[PDB]
Design a protein around this nucleic acid. Structure first.
Lengths: 133, 753, 755
RNA sequence: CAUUGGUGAGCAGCGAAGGAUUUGGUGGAUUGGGGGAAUGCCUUGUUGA
């Protein structure tokens, strides 16, 4: 539990509860949409669109099967969509700590806008445009 | 009496030299200080202006003394009893002699006169609010004692009254009127008396530096202290256990003194102006290491013994001498910039606090003769430009940090700086020297930039239009200059009739006003290099003037004690105000609300309120020495019977058409014979050349509602005669449509082509 | 232009919380926003008083007995006084604590404020001039209570104060130290929390209401004292009575709910008259007119930003919208209607000259990014984040087409030709630009030319040139209607987001990636780069617009500021928004040359060129009297009255010198006017026309002038463009009146001939 | 050869009987998802007093 709270420089303790509720909604959506006859194109089409939008959200960066929806969607996946982890893994800063130290005091820029929030999220297609000021 | 400006308030006032007094509001304290014919009530701990009195006295305030809520002030023979700055009661001495001092104890009012007579007032009930009932009148014969110094009252002396003379002490029994005690003749004249926290001791400061701890029961000295060359003005007791004493001099120097180890510890040095009389009153509060200082120099300072010397804790003050030049700093009427002749520099607020801040100059600097201000680049570098008397370099100033600039500005011709000016963008510094050179600096990097020289006497004023394109100037040689600022090209100049003493530019209307030596105000256009007006009437020297913010008015003031206002479109003087003291300077606020005057006597800055609610006036001189609503309203998306029959008799349908045009959309009322008189009413409607836009709607709604009874199944009854009466006049009104087709199509063609 | 531009309107009504009340006149609506106070008049909504000393965004508001005094209270406890036209008469920090309610007398003598655990009543100042440092005088104060005072009620005697308290109780106060009936007797027994009390206007029924729906009735028997008369117990209604107001008709009750519905009742009958639903969003407060004819109730900030006006015979008088933070604005070709784009995905039309909320369109699935009119006045194209664009015509209210066709989730910039043939949209996440013929939605081409996200697009009035600014330091120019394509330039600097076109096809304005805003022509001669965008309470360049006369541009970023510039270098004027916690996101320029717009997160537009300022155009005062010399030229020389009194500019003169000259004189006047005194009078007629009823009179003027100098305004364009638009809207809005009704008396005479 | 980085001694100039850097306290104004029962609970029916 608090392993996740300490790995990714979470400024709070509430954020693990919130992302736990969102991932719970995704799992119960997966189970309810799972229990249909598998030739019903309702199930195929809606699980397909759920796959494609979860491609775009960067959570399932891995190209996926259906059964990954039970398997990989955790809190830590969406926590790896937080800004300084994108910053570190894009090899700008040196630690996650120092990335959060830079976003606390305004040197980081996504697009044309200043950022000062350590809970802004990035897509799989907005992270091309990250620079400094 | 005035038709533009109204007397609003004075700002910048802290003290005048009258002794302040301390009051108790529950557990905290307040201070009662005099200014003139108006007093102020401050916090004792954090120094906020808590009250200003509502109404000025006829004459100057002499004695001030207070109780739990009741501030008592003195003038000619009247005692003003006020609460919260508002009068409860006016209680007058039955004489004409001037009131000197007041002592208020128990239920009595003790009123000293200048003729050595004292009046005694009483309450009715011991739970009443103030004394108002006469009790008696005592006198001081000069065979019993000299002139009355002051009035005090020592505690637990039932009905005894302490009246000290310049020689001896008279102790009275006011209920009976007796003189129960007289003291023997003292060597030196007494100027200071003060009660003690213990019984029966009263302190006496002599004319020389002698302190006398006198006892009232036995009548003998206990201790005296000699201070060489000191005129004692004030005594008080720090009763926080630390039994000390302060002794005030007339020099502004203050002796903080230890009474049992017998130690000269401290002296405050020109904390109050010896020129203004030095320390007027110094008082300890009861029970805290706090002493309050006020003098004649328009400032209160709190000195507290940090637990051992005291310390400057917090204070409020202003220019001790009356001001020389002011300016408005903001476009929101908040902070004003003020410079005087006692060489200080203060930035005041205008708002309800009356907090203010003296600038940072970091033995004072020479006084300012020419000031200029811009508020375009605040916070980044300096934006205030000041000259000085008999100097050759103009200093700069920051409005943000309240601190002095970092640049000195040279004339480069060995003259005196006679005029300063800034552009609108705040990049440039214009300086005009008394030998006639106009030099131009950067305001950012403090560097020399550019130099012009056309005038051959002292350049008395420079300005620049808001577009930074055309540069105007004026000399003592009657020459007005007109330049390009983008180039160094020499565009055009004018010869006039007199030397020019002042120049104030108005930027959003592109005019300027010049004050000549022939006592006339000339108004000159800036664009076409042309004189447009010349105004006469001030009998003496024009001193200061300013444009109103919307550029319609000019207000000048002069040594004929007149303050006149001059409407530019009519060329005529619209109002003068004839005052009793002649104001040095005047400026409009950038908002259209406030007019600022600075005077010769007194230190404050008087503020005037522009009325700006109305007027239609132009009066003069010398005196005492909808159309969518109905047409959208008709399409519905979701008695009166006397008049039409009286119109059945004659042609009275104008009142009926008035009750049609008045109110009540009558789509149900025209449905409750009579239709013929309705159509004749309508033909009287078209007969006049008005309100056709409602009338056509009446006609068409009539053909919407009753259109079957109009039709009569098979027409040409007497209905159709009234329709025939409507037809030809409706053919008369056919003309207006083709004009609309003409303008619509031709305007469409000039839109296309 | 030099004029004093200042706020005297706002963009849509209620964004924020507060009280609400009418005037005593019944024709003036008092409906604040959080930041300022917007008092409409009920017929033809306009804007009267505009205070701003509010540092905090809540109001408490009431007028005395004729509307000559208005207050407004925010959270801190300072108030501000205005009389009729926002003089800002008095100003007064009143309290270090907040206020719950403010109430006048019907007599204007006493003054009522509820705060803390006390109750303040003040002696009211009359209207005068200023000259009071502290104008308010304390009359009495009353101690005490047990906790907070939440509602307040005044009586007709001006002797009798009924006030509730937070501790489930009510109290009575005699004003003039009378001790009315020698009793200030409490009211108890209430099981639940008290939301209000009322005193009836016949002095015999004392009224209380609780939060549950309970209502308790006490009598004026003071056997001897208070007895209950009618009780209730509600357990199944299961909401909370949020607000309550009582009729001056003294027969009826009004009860507002958190559940989102509107209750009406009778006082001693307890009959259910009507209840009405409007949503689920809670009712904040409700107040009735002084005659019971009109009802108005306000809705809370997080819920509806909507205030309705329902009558007792059940029809809604004023309905409205006014939703949240705004993306985009554009002026219609008639200078009267203004589109808005909201975040929740609607498109609303605002008639901001008159305060109506006219009409809506709702087909968006998410937020709207771009709106712009076509020059025909027929159609307007909306762009979304829906992944498609669509067309709209005005009062046919019908969707023409919805262009899309490549797989896409984001569009960001929409622009059309003046020709109405082709519509282009720029994908924020494709490196390409899309066109569509409006005939079909056929795809002509896909014009591949960029290397970054394309982010701003506009056309020209020459209409052979496409201006294409992408976010890769590269400005591009395109040909669409020839038989080839083109070479596209390179910027020097600083990634651009904001592009703005001159209406000539000859000038292009760009916003560089800092405070420098720069311009260059279509032969890339860079004229000016201009200095930063100040006023922090980082720096940006978001929107920019070229004014219509061709002499000014307006810059707006996201830093509480907006700047004016001319074609040369100079900073003209910087206006700005004061409030406390982006603001600006879009700015465009009116075709009436009277004002322009700035889309803010608050929502605030107007600039309003006025004429109260003394301008001296051509040596005004050599014409020494504006009165007597003009009086000489009303008797003689009517050519010289125009040139004389026209150099003068008292608006209180132009009505009479313009009216008084005779009809036959007019073509002689217009044939002999100078060509330099022409545009200010052509602009004067175009805005004086819309007010009066002198249609024949002004129409023979515009016949004379437009008949006079047609070729001169044909060649000397771009000012009589603005004036000509201003007169053409008057021509069409009168033509569609009198042609309609003159037709409606053109059928009649031959309809008589029928049978 | 690059008045190239570190370091020290002098000179022109600027100022005069004190100058340059650094820091503490103090006052004024501003700032949860998937499964499950015994046991327990909840709901409902019942059995005897």
């Amino acid at each position: 539990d608090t392993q996740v709270m300490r790995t990714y420089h979470i400024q709070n303790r509430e954020d693990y509860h919130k992302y736990n509720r969102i991932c719970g909604d995704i799992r119960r959506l997966a189970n309810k949409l799972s229990l249909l006859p598998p030739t019903d194109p309702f199930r195929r089409k809606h699980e397909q669109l759920l796959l494609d939008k979860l491609y775009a959200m960067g959570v399932l960066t891995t190209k996926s099967k259906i059964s990954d929806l039970e398997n990989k969607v955790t809190v830590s996946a969406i926590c790896r969509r937080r800004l300084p982890v994108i910053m570190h893994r894009l090899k700008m800063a040196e630690t996650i700590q120092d990335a959060v130290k830079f976003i606390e005091q305004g040197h980081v820029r996504v697009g044309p806008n200043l950022i000062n929030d350590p809970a802004y999220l990035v897509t799989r297609n907005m992270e091309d445009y990250v620079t400094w000021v | 009496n005035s038709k533009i400006f109204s007397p609003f308030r004075i700002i910048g006032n802290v003290s005048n030299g009258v002794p302040f007094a301390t009051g108790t509001l529950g557990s905290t304290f307040y201070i009662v200080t005099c200014v003139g014919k108006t007093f102020q009530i401050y916090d004792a701990n954090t120094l906020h202006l808590l009250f200003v009195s509502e109404k000025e006295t006829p004459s100057s305030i002499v004695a001030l003394s207070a109780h739990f809520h009741y501030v008592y002030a003195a003038y000619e023979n009247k005692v003003g009893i006020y609460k919260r700055g508002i009068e409860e009661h006016l209680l007058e001495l039955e004489t004409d002699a001037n009131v000197e001092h007041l002592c208020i104890f128990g239920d009595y009012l003790c009123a000293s006169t200048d003729d050595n007579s004292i009046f005694i007032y009483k309450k009715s009930d011991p739970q009443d609010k103030y004394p108002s009932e006469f009790y008696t009148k005592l006198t001081v014969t000069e065979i019993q004692g000299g002139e009355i110094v002051s009035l005090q009252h020592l505690a637990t002396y039932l009905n005894k009254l302490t009246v000290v003379t310049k020689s001896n002490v008279l102790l009275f029994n006011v209920r009976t009127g007796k003189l129960v005690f007289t003291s023997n003749e003292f060597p030196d004249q007494i100027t200071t008396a003060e009660p003690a926290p213990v019984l029966d001791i009263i302190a006496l400061g002599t004319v020389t530096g002698e302190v006398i701890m006198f006892n009232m029961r036995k009548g003998k000295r206990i201790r005296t202290i000699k201070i060489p060359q000191s005129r004692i003005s004030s005594l008080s007791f720090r009763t926080d256990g630390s039994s000390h004493l302060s002794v005030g001099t007339s020099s502004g120097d203050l002796i903080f003194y230890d009474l049992d180890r017998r130690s000269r510890i401290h002296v405050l040095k020109n904390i109050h102006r010896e020129s203004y009389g030095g320390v007027t009153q110094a008082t300890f509060l009861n029970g805290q290491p706090i002493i309050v200082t006020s003098g004649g120099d328009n400032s209160l300072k709190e000195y507290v013994f940090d637990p051992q010397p005291p310390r400057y804790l917090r204070s409020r003050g202003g220019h001790s001498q009356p001001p020389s030049y002011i300016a408005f700093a903001d476009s929101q009427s908040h902070f004003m910039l003020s410079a005087s002749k006692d060489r200080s520099l203060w930035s005041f607020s205008l708002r309800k606090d009356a907090q203010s801040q003296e600038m940072s100059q970091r033995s004072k600097f020479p006084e300012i003769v020419a000031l200029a201000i811009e508020n375009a680049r605040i916070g980044e570098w300096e934006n205030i430009i000041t000259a000085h008397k008999d100097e050759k370099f103009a200093r700069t100033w920051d409005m943000r940090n309240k601190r002095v600039g970092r640049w000195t500005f040279d004339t480069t011709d060995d003259g005196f700086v006679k005029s300063v000016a800034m552009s609108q963008c705040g990049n440039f510094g214009f300086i005009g020297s008394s030998n006639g050179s106009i030099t131009i600096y950067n305001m950012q990097s403090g560097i020399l930039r550019k130099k012009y020289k056309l005038h051959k006497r002292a350049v008395t004023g420079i300005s620049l239009d808001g577009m930074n394109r055309k540069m105007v100037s004026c000399g003592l040689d009657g020459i007005v200059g007109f330049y390009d600022f983008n180039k160094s090209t020499l565009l055009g100049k004018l010869k006039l009739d007199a030397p020019i003493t002042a120049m104030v530019y108005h930027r959003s209307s592109d005019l300027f006003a010049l004050a000549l030596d022939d006592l006339s105000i000339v108004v000159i256009d800036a664009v076409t290099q042309r004189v447009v007006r010349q105004l006469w009437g001030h009998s003496n020297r024009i001193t200061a003037f300013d444009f109103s913010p919307e550029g319609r008015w000019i207000v000048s003031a002069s040594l004929d004690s007149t303050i006149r206002t001059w409407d530019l479109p009519t060329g005529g003087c619209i109002d003068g105000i004839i005052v009793d003291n002649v104001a040095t300077n005047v400026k409009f606020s950038p908002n259209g609300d406030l007019l600022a005057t600075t005077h010769v006597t007194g230190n404050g800055i008087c503020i005037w309120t522009n009325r700006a609610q109305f007027k239609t006036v132009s009066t003069r001189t010398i005196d005492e020495s909808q159309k969518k609503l109905d047409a959208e309203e008709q399409m519905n998306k979701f008695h009166f019977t006397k008049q039409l029959r009286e119109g059945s008799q004659s042609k009275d349908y104008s009142s009926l058409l008035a009750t049609l045009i008045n109110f009540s959309p009558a789509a149900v009322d025209l449905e409750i014979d009579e239709i013929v008189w309705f159509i004749d009413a309508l033909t009287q409607g078209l007969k006049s050349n008005k309100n056709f836009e409602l009338y056509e709607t009446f006609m068409s709604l009539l053909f919407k509602a009753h259109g079957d009874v109009i039709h009569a199944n098979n027409k040409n009854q007497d209905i159709a005669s009234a329709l025939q009466n409507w037809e030809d006049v409706h053919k008369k009104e056919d003309r207006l449509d083709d004009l609309v087709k003409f303008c619509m199509g031709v305007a469409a063609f000039v839109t296309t082509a | 232009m030099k004029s004093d531009f200042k706020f005297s309107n706002l963009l849509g009504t209620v964004y924020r919380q507060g009280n609400i009340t009418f005037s005593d006149d019944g024709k003036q609506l008092l409906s604040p926003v959080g930041n300022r106070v917007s008092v409409f008049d009920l017929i033809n909504n306009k804007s009267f008083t505009f205070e701003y000393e509010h540092r905090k965004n809540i109001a408490a508001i009431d007028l005395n007995k004729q509307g000559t005094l208005l207050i407004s209270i925010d959270e801190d406890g300072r108030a501000i006084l205005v009389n009729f036209k926002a003089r800002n008469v008095l100003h007064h920090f009143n309290f270090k604590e907040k206020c719950s309610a403010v109430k006048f007398s019907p007599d204007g003598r006493l003054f009522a404020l509820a705060s803390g655990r006390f109750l303040q009543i003040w002696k009211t100042p009359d209207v005068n001039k200023d000259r009071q440092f502290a104008p308010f005088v304390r009359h009495r104060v009353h101690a005490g209570h047990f906790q907070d005072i939440t509602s307040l009620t005044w009586s007709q005697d001006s002797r009798f104060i009924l006030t509730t308290s937070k501790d489930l109780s009510a109290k009575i106060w005699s004003v003039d130290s009378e001790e009315k009936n020698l009793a200030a007797t409490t009211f108890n027994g209430h099981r639940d929390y008290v939301m209000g009390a009322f005193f009836s206007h016949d002095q015999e029924k004392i009224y209380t209401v609780s939060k549950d729906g309970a209502v308790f009735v006490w009598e004026f028997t003071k056997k001897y004292s208070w007895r209950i008369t009618k009780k209730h117990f509600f357990y199944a209604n299961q909401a909370k009575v949020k607000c309550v107001t009582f009729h001056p008709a003294t027969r009826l009750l009004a009860v507002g709910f958190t559940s989102g519905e509107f209750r009406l009742y009778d006082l001693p009958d307890f009959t259910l008259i009507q209840q009405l639903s409007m949503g689920q969003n809670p009712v904040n407060t409700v107040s009735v007119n002084q005659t019971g004819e009109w009802l108005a109730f306000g809705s809370s900030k997080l819920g509806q930003l909507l205030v309705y006006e329902w009558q007792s015979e059940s029809y809604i008088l004023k309905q409205q919208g006014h939703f949240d933070s705004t993306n985009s604005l554009a002026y219609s070709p008639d200078g009267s209607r203004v589109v808005t784009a909201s975040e929740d995905g609607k498109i609303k039309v605002w008639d901001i000259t008159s305060g109506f909320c006219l009409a809506t369109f709702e087909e968006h699935t998410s937020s709207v990014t771009a709106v712009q009119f076509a020059k025909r006045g027929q159609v307007m194209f909306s762009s979304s984040l829906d992944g498609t664009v669509r067309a709209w015509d005005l009062i046919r209210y019908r969707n023409f087409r919805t262009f899309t066709g490549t797989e896409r989730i984001q569009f960001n910039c929409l622009a059309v030709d003046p020709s109405g043939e082709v519509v282009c949209a720029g994908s924020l996440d494709n490196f390409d630009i899309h066109v569509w013929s409006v005939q079909t939605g056929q795809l002509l081409d896909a014009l591949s030319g960029h290397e970054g996200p394309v982010s701003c697009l506009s056309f020209s009035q020459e209409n052979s040139v496409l201006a294409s600014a992408s976010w890769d330091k590269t400005i591009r120019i395109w040909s669409i209607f020839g038989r080839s394509q083109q070479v596209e330039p390179i910027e020097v600097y600083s990634d651009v987001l904001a592009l703005s076109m001159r209406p000539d096809g000859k000038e292009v304005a760009v916003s560089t990636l800092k405070g420098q805003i720069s311009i260059f022509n279509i032969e890339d001669a860079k004229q000016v780069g201009n200095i930063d965008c100040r006023k922090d309470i980082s720096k940006f360049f978001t929107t920019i617009h070229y004014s219509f006369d061709g002499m000014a541009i307006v810059a707006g970023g996201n830093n509480n500021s907006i700047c004016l510039y001319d074609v040369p270098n100079e900073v003209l004027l910087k206006r700005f928004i004061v409030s406390r916690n982006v603001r600006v996101t879009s700015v465009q320029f009116s075709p009436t040359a009277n004002a322009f717009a700035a889309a803010s997160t608050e929502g605030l537009l107007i600039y309003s060129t006025n004429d109260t300022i003394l301008f001296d155009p051509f040596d005004l005062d050599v014409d020494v009297t504006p009165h007597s010399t003009v009086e000489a030229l009303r008797e003689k020389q009517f050519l010289n009255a125009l040139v004389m009194a026209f150099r003068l500019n008292e608006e209180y003169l132009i009505n009479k010198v313009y009216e008084a000259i005779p009809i036959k004189e007019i073509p002689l006047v217009a044939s002999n006017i100078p060509a330099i005194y022409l545009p200010r009078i052509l602009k004067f007629i175009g805005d004086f026309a819309i007010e009066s009823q002198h249609i024949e009179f002004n129409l023979i003027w515009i016949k004379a002038l437009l008949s006079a100098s047609g070729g001169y305004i044909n060649e000397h364009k771009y000012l009589f463009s603005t004036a000509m638009r201003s007169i053409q809207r008057f021509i069409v809005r009168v033509a569609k009146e009198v042609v309609n009704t003159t037709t409606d008396n053109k059928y009649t005479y031959r309809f008589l001939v029928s049978t």
